[PDB]
Amino acid sequence: GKISFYEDRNFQGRRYDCDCDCADFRSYLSRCNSIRVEGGTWAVYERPNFSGHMYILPQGEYPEYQRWMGLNDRLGSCRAVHLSSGGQAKIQVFEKGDFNGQMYETTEDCPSIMEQFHLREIHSCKVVEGTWIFYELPNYRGRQYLLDKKEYRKPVDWGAASPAIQSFRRIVEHHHHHH
Numbered sequence: 001g002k003i004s005f006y007e008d009r010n011f012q013g014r015r016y017d018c019d020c021d022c023a024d025f026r027s028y029l030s031r032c033n034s035i036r037v038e039g040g041t042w043a044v045y046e047r048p049n050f051s052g053h054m055y056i057l058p059q060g061e062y063p064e065y066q067r068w069m070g071l072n073d074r075l076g077s078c079r080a081v082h083l084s085s086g087g088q089a090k091i092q093v094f095e096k097g098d099f100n101g102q103m104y105e106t107t108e109d110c111p112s113i114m115e116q117f118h119l120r121e122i123h124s125c126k127v128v129e130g131t132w133i134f135y136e137l138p139n140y141r142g143r144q145y146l147l148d149k150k151e152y153r154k155p156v157d158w159g160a161a162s163p164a165i166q167s168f169r170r171i172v173e174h175h176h177h178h179h
Contacts, residue, residue, distance in 0.1 A: 001039035003057070003078060009033045010063045021079040024048035031073040035062045041081040041173060043146050044068075048076040054144055054159065056081065056133055058174045069141075081131065081146065081171075089130025089170040091147070097123045098153045109169040112138045121163040126151045131171050134158060138166040 001020075007013035007029050016028045026048055035044070037059045046052030055068045062068050088107050095101030104117045105128075113119045122134070127149045136142030145158045145165075155163045 001080070003038070003040075003042045003044075004036040005029055005032045005044075005075065005078075006034040006036075007031055011036060011061070018042075018078055021077075023050065023077050025078075026076045029075075032075040033065060033073045035068065037062070041083050041171065042078050043081055044075050045077045045079075046074050050077050050079060052076075054146065056144060056146060056171065058171075059176075060174075069144075082148070083131050083171060083173040085173045085175065087130060089132060089172075090128040091132050091168065092126045092128060093117070093119070093122045093168075094124040095119060099124050099126070099151075107170075111140065111167050113166055113168070114138070122165040123155070123163045124153055125158075132168050133171055134160075134165045135167045135169075136162075136164055140167050140169060142166075 003018050005016045005025060011034050014029055016025045035057060037057050039059065041056065041058045043054050043056055045054050053071060055070055057068050065073050090107050092103050092105045094103050110116050127147050132147045134145040134147060145160055147158050152158050
């Protein structure tokens with residue numbers, strides 16, 4: 001289980017490897033233009049100490065930041081995501097803060113919450129089973145937020161300065177099926 005960050009594209013230039021969580025790789029890489037992910041899923045963060053914009057990267061090779069939907073080459077920390085490989089995931093999303101208002105429960109992915117639930121925003125939520133990613137825009141675009149199993153009374157609790165979410169999906173661990 002290892003994530004390798006590279007300063008230049010196509011796995012060239014200075015490299016920093018992480019086995020688990022690293023709160024600050026700024027002193028080793030000035031920027032990150034390609035990433036190799038082996039044996040797990042990571043959340044990578046724009047700033048040190050798990051702050052700023054985040055991106056989720058399943059196992060794979062990412063030769064340019066666009067391959068992880070990155071806005072730019074600024075990354076400074078990462079943490080391993082502890083994921084299921086299977087089993088139902090279930091989330092409850094609320095119209096209002098602190099679990100007030102209408103509640104919507106689903107086990108399925110949602111590419112447009114406006115269309116499915118007539119919600120513009122998610123003000124609180126409970127992840128009942130599994131792991132989910134929230135996205136600012138419809139169809140799994142825009143800023144991302146990782147929600148593992150626990151309760152989230154307000155958007156701050158999933159790292160957001162806004163309840164503006166329009167899509168969400170389950171994530172499970174991606175494994176190759178070797179012969």
